[PDB]
Scaffold this active site. Structure first.
Site, PDB file in Angstrom:
ATOM      1  N   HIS A  40      34.536 -28.871  16.470  1.00  0.00           N
ATOM      2  CA  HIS A  40      34.935 -30.067  17.186  1.00  0.00           C
ATOM      3  C   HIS A  40      34.729 -29.969  18.699  1.00  0.00           C
ATOM      4  O   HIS A  40      34.861 -30.997  19.354  1.00  0.00           O
ATOM      5  CB  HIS A  40      36.361 -30.486  16.837  1.00  0.00           C
ATOM      6  CG  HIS A  40      37.507 -29.863  17.526  1.00  0.00           C
ATOM      7  ND1 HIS A  40      38.252 -28.838  16.999  1.00  0.00           N
ATOM      8  CD2 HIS A  40      38.102 -30.204  18.677  1.00  0.00           C
ATOM      9  CE1 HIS A  40      39.264 -28.583  17.819  1.00  0.00           C
ATOM     10  NE2 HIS A  40      39.212 -29.411  18.848  1.00  0.00           N
ATOM     11  N   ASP A  84      36.055 -25.956  10.698  1.00  0.00           N
ATOM     12  CA  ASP A  84      36.029 -26.205  12.129  1.00  0.00           C
ATOM     13  C   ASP A  84      35.590 -24.931  12.849  1.00  0.00           C
ATOM     14  O   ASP A  84      36.386 -24.207  13.469  1.00  0.00           O
ATOM     15  CB  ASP A  84      37.344 -26.780  12.608  1.00  0.00           C
ATOM     16  CG  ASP A  84      37.272 -27.260  14.040  1.00  0.00           C
ATOM     17  OD1 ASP A  84      36.140 -27.429  14.513  1.00  0.00           O
ATOM     18  OD2 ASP A  84      38.327 -27.482  14.632  1.00  0.00           O
ATOM     19  N   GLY A 175      42.680 -28.287  24.942  1.00  0.00           N
ATOM     20  CA  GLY A 175      41.952 -27.480  25.909  1.00  0.00           C
ATOM     21  C   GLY A 175      41.986 -25.999  25.548  1.00  0.00           C
ATOM     22  O   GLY A 175      41.241 -25.223  26.122  1.00  0.00           O
ATOM     23  N   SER A 177      41.408 -25.431  22.312  1.00  0.00           N
ATOM     24  CA  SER A 177      40.550 -25.546  21.136  1.00  0.00           C
ATOM     25  C   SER A 177      39.325 -24.640  21.245  1.00  0.00           C
ATOM     26  O   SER A 177      38.669 -24.550  22.286  1.00  0.00           O
ATOM     27  CB  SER A 177      40.097 -26.945  20.921  1.00  0.00           C
ATOM     28  OG  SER A 177      41.208 -27.756  20.668  1.00  0.00           O
ATOM     29  N   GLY A 178      38.978 -24.030  20.101  1.00  0.00           N
ATOM     30  CA  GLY A 178      37.808 -23.167  20.022  1.00  0.00           C
ATOM     31  C   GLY A 178      38.109 -21.711  20.345  1.00  0.00           C
ATOM     32  O   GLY A 178      37.283 -20.829  20.165  1.00  0.00           O
TER      33      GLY A 178
END
Ligand SMILES: [Ca+2]
Length: 223
Positions: A40, A84, A175, A177-178
Site C-alpha cells: 500500500h 500487503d 506514516g 506503514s511499510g
C-alpha cells in the site's frame, strides 16, 4: 508510533525512510540492494533513505539511493490489504556498516507472546496529529490469532497478525506503514493497518513476513 520512545540515532540500522519529496512510508533493508515495504506504500519516484535519524536534517550517516524497480506482491488486494508486501530494488548497492545494516528474514514464524520492536516516523498521537523528525520505537508483543480475529471480525487473513496492546495507548500509526516489526533479530512483520491508532480493542495489524520468505528469495534471485 504512539506511546513509544526515541530509538536513538542509527540504533535500528535496517530502518529505511521512503521519500517522494517527503517521508511517506517505512521499509526494511534486507540486503545491500533490496528493501521490503508494504504494497500500500507503492508509488513511482521513490528515493530510499538509509542511515536516517532526523529525516529533516543531514546528520552525516545517510545514504540516498533511487529505486530502480518496485515489485508489489502478485496477490496484493488493496481493498482487504491481503498480501500487503512489496520489494524495492535499489539502483546501487548500499554500503553496509554499523549504522546501515540488513535485517535477517525469518526461518520460522513468530508466536504469540514474543516481544518485538516496531519503529517508524509516523504520527505520535491517537487523537491528534504530530509527526516526529527522529525515529520512534515501540516494544510490543504478538497477540494470539483468536484475539486478533476477535478484534477485527471477518478481516484477519492467514497473512496477517496483530501486535500491540488491547488496552490502547501504544501502537504504530499513519506514516509508520511499510516499516519493521523485528522479533529476536528477525523481520516478522510489516506495518500494515488498523482502526485509528492506539485505540482500545483495536491493535496494529501487520503483514506476516514468514509466509513470504520463499517469494522474497526467489524474486531477489531473478531480479
Ligand atoms: Ca537525516
Amino acid at each position: 508510533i504512539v506511546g513509544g520512545y526515541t530509538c536513538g540515532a542509527n540504533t535500528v540500522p535496517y530502518q529505511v525512510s521512503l521519500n517522494s519529496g517527503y517521508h511517506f512510508c517505512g521499509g526494511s533493508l534486507i540486503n545491500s540492494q533490496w528493501v521490503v515495504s508494504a504494497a500500500h506504500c507503492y508509488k513511482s519516484g521513490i528515493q530510499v533513505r538509509l542511515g536516517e535519524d532526523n529525516i529533516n536534517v543531514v546528520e552525516g550517516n545517510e545514504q540516498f539511493i533511487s529505486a530502480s524497480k518496485s515489485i508489489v506482491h502478485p496477490s496484493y488486494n488493496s481493498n482487504t490489504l491481503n498480501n500487503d508486501i512489496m520489494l524495492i530494488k535499489l539502483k546501487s548497492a548500499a554500503s553496509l556498516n554499523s549504522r546501515v545494516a540488513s535485517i535477517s528474514l525469518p526461518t520460522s514464524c513468530a508466536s504469540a507472546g514474543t516481544q518485538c520492536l516496531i519503529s517508524g516516523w509516523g504520527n505520535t498521537k491517537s487523537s491528534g496529529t504530530s509527526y516526529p523528525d527522529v525515529l520512534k520505537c515501540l516494544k510490543a508483543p504478538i497477540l494470539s490469532d483468536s484475539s486478533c480475529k476477535s478484534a477485527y471480525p471477518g478481516q484477519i487473513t492467514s497473512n496477517m497478525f496483530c501486535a500491540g496492546y488491547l488496552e490502547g495507548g501504544k501502537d504504530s500509526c499513519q506514516g509508520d506503514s511499510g516499516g519493521p516489526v523485528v522479533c529476536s533479530g528477525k523481520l516478522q512483520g510489516i506495518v500494515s493497518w488498523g482502526s485509528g491508532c492506539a485505540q482500545k480493542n483495536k491493535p496494529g495489524v501487520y503483514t506476516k513476513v514468514c509466509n513470504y520468505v520463499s517469494w522474497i528469495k526467489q524474486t531477489i534471485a531473478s531480479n
